[PDB]
From a paper:
In the best characterized pathway, importin (IMP) α bridges cargoes bearing basic, classical nuclear localization signals (cNLSs) to IMPβ1, which mediates transport through the nuclear pore complex. IMPα recognizes three types of cNLSs via two binding sites: the major binding site accommodates monopartite cNLSs, the minor binding site recognizes atypical cNLSs, while bipartite cNLSs simultaneously interact with both major and minor sites. We combined bioinformatic, biochemical, functional, and structural approaches to study this phenomenon, using polyomaviruses (PyVs) large tumor antigens (LTAs) as a model.
Strikingly, all other tested cNLS peptides bound as bipartite cNLSs (NLSbip), occupying both the minor and major binding sites of IMPα2ΔIBB with their upstream and downstream basic clusters, respectively. Similar results were obtained for GFP‐WUPyV LTA NLSbip, which localized to the nucleus to higher levels than GFP‐WUPyV LTA NLSct and the derivative GFP‐WUPyV LTA NLSbip_m, bearing the K124A/R125A/R126A substitutions. Such a scenario is exemplified by MWPyV and WUPyV LTAs, whose two cNLSs are still functional independent of each other, but together act as a bipartite cNLS. Furthermore, all tested HPyV LTA cNLSs exhibited IMPα isoform specificity, with those from WUPyV and JCPyV binding preferentially to IMPα1ΔIBB, and that from KIPyV binding preferentially to IMPα7ΔIBB.
Numbering used by the authors:
A (entry chain A): 75 to 497
B (entry chain C): 124 to 126, 138 to 146
């Protein structure tokens, strides 16, 4: 449990072994659990010394200790990672990546992962120094099983961070250089490797449809669905996020998701005990019901409309908001037959009960959905029956009360409905 | 249509 001053005295000596001991003391000090002294170590000016030690090919232990210490420093605030980067650590770690000693290279992977995880700028800087080539060279083996578990996990997490963050998104050339190894890692059996790969794919699918197309062309959607059916939540969460991001794009990408068999999993996702899983699944359903009428009909065929009715009847308010969005998209883009089927599944009562809330946006969404349903009824000449139904459930009172809402669109919609169909 | 693993991690 050395002091900062003792570590400084040791590192400033002209003895390689004394420097090694002081660097190990620094590592152990920065490895503590309760408030490691990162800021005090930075103020002592020890980062350049560790960076210099990184290059002592003749003394592997000092390389390892300085790498560990710099890793733990770069794991903190953006300012501390900036200190590490300003010390010149990126090229030294990239050089260490090719060390004959495996633990040194693993520590280099770890440090570069932290630096890239800082944000977009440091990610692009790590990429510019040329880390992707040696990193992927570490994984260029016939069978990933020959590599050590921790080594592979750290490599996967570092790559996931190299795929992470937006504004700007990762350079396209780097994504193309990384994607094959990411696909090979997405087929590995270790749960942590799988979760990190799914998070990387999630990051890469968040953005314009061209990035989504990059990912989908690699043919990873079936594996993403398979993992969506996984038992480990750490795997299902990123897989569900990736599938949702994929279906936020073109109708053909959403259709590739559907062909993979994703809908079959949603009965359990829309009833999943974890609120976030339910919310993400309902949002995915909302973006699927905004697609083609063929895709709406595929939502119907899989028996997912009753599950949406259920979510609308009882769920977290945010999941209920996503469900109202899904219903309004369904009604806007659906056939008269599909809107009728939706009514027969019992949407009117829950959708009305949700008009007594205090969120103006959902009130507008619901009134728009009801306008669409009334339009379909007019198409079939059943406007009066729908009116009787919205009455018996106690909705008419809700609409006539919304007529007195501060918002203008709520006022207009409530009135319009009352006067057109209820008078 | 409309629109996590720790970024940084310490050793020990």
């Amino acid at each position: 449990n050395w002091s900062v001053e003792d570590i400084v005295k040791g590192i400033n000596s002209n003895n390689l072994e004394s420097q090694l001991q002081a660097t190990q003391a620094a590592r152990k000090l920065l490895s503590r659990e309760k408030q490691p002294p990162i800021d005090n170590i930075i103020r002592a000016g020890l980062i350049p010394k560790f960076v210099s030690f990184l290059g002592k090919t003749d003394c592997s232990p000092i390389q390892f200790e300085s790498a560990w210490a710099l890793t733990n420093i770069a794991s903190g605030t953006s300012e501390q990672t900036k200190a590490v980067v300003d010390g010149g650590a990126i090229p030294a770690f990239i050089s260490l990546l090719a060390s004959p000693h495996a633990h040194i290279s693993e520590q280099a992977v770890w440090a570069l992962g932290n630096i890239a995880g800082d944000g977009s700028a440091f990610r692009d800087l790590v990429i510019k120094h040329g880390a992707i080539d040696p990193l992927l060279a570490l994984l260029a083996v016939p069978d990933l099983s020959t590599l050590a578990c921790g080594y592979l996990r750290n490599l996967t997490w570092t790559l996931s961070n190299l795929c992470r963050n937006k504004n700007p998104a990762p350079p396209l050339d780097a994504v193309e250089q990384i994607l094959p190894t990411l696909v090979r890692l997405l087929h590995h059996n270790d749960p942590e490797v799988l979760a990190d790969s799914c998070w990387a794919i999630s990051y890469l699918t968040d953005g314009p449809n061209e990035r989504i197309e990059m990912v989908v062309k690699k043919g990873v959607v079936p594996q993403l669905v398979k993992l969506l059916g996984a038992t480990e939540l750490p795997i299902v969460t990123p897989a569900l996020r990736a599938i949702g991001n994929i279906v936020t794009g073109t109708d053909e990408q959403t259709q590739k998701v559907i062909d993979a068999g994703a809908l079959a999993v949603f009965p359990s996702l829309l009833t999943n005990p974890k609120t976030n899983i339910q919310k993400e699944a309902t949002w995915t359903m909302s973006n699927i019901t905004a697609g083609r009428q063929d895709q709406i009909q595929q939502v119907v065929n899989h028996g997912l409309v009753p599950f949406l009715v259920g979510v609308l009847s009882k769920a977290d308010f945010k999941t209920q908001k996503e469900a109202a969005w899904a219903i309004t998209n369904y009604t806007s883009g659906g056939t008269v037959e599909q809107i009728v089927y939706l009514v027969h599944c019992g949407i009117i009562e829950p959708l009305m009960n949700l008009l007594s809330a205090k969120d103006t946006k959902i009130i507008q969404v619901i009134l728009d959905a009801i306008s669409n349903i009334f339009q379909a009824a007019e198409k079939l000449g059943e406007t009066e029956k729908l009116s009787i139904m919205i009455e018996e459930c106690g909705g008419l009172d809700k609409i006539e009360a919304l007529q007195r809402h501060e918002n203008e669109s709520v006022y207009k919609a409530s009135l319009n409905l009352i006067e057109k169909y209820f008078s | 249509k409309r629109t996590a693993t720790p970024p940084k991690k310490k050793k020990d």
